[PDB]
Amino acid sequence: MEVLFEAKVGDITLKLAQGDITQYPAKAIVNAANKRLEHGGGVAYAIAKACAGDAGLYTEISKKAMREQFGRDYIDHGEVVVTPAMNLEERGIKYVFHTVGPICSGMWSEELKEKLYKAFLGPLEKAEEMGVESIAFPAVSAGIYGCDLEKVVETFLEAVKNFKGSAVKEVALVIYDRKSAEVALKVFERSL
Numbered sequence: 001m002e003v004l005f006e007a008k009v010g011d012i013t014l015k016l017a018q019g020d021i022t023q024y025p026a027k028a029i030v031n032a033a034n035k036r037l038e039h040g041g042g043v044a045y046a047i048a049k050a051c052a053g054d055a056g057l058y059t060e061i062s063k064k065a066m067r068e069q070f071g072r073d074y075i076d077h078g079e080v081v082v083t084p085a086m087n088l089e090e091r092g093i094k095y096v097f098h099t100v101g102p103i104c105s106g107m108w109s110e111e112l113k114e115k116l117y118k119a120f121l122g123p124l125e126k127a128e129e130m131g132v133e134s135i136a137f138p139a140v141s142a143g144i145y146g147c148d149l150e151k152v153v154e155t156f157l158e159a160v161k162n163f164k165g166s167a168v169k170e171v172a173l174v175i176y177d178r179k180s181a182e183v184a185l186k187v188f189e190r191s192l
């Protein structure tokens with residue numbers, strides 16, 4: 001895990017790091033899920049495998065959690081399903097907060113931005129509600145959902161800036177590949 005940037009946004013310490021989110025030292029990590037919480041690939045698969053030892057098992061656990069937390073088999077942008085991090089608890093990660101970003105498919109609009117904005121703010125508000133002090137996020141929608149990485153990072157930063165809370169003290173954005181981390185770093189530098 002390599003930290004590439006650190007700054008304060010109010011009382012929150014914000015970090016950009018390059019690495020695997022399942023190894024980040026945060027109490028909650030966020031999953032870039034689909035609305036059905038079927039963890040087929042990308043960071044959802046990585047998280048599901050790291051937590052349960054089998055992604056399929058974590059998918060079932062997630063669906064059960066969603067059914068009881070929401071009373072249905074899908075979530076809307078901004079809604080957050082919470083599941084225990086299981087095997088990751090030994091490294092201090094207690095929860096996975098599943099969020100669902102929009103499917104951009106190479107496009108960008110205010111409607112897509114608003115959906116992604118909700119997908120980033122929702123987990124921050126859930127952390128606040130639960131009294132969770134540290135949370136880490138992946139670049140929601142920047143993978144197979146095809147949202148431009150720069151736009152994803154700018155949207156994440158807007159959510160962190162607008163968030164109001166007292167319990168959340170540390171937020172991190174964890175980027176996986178080297179090329180992408182460089183793009184994110186430039187966004188952090190020009191935004192702050």
Ligand SMILES: Nc1ncnc2c1ncn2[C@@H]1O[C@H](COP(=O)(O)OP(=O)(O)OC[C@H]2O[C@H](O)[C@H](O)[C@@H]2O)[C@@H](O)[C@H]1O
Nearest residue numbers: 020021032034040041042043044046141142143144145176
């Ligand atoms: N271990 C990891 N740690 C941090 N980031 C990662 C990791 N693995 C991948 N990424 C980055 O995570 C970012 C997000 O890529 P994506 O995981 O496709 O998510 P989406 O929101 O676009 O697609 C959601 C759908 O994909 C799944 O199949 C779900 O079940 C959904 O069906 C990229 O920058 C990756 O390089």
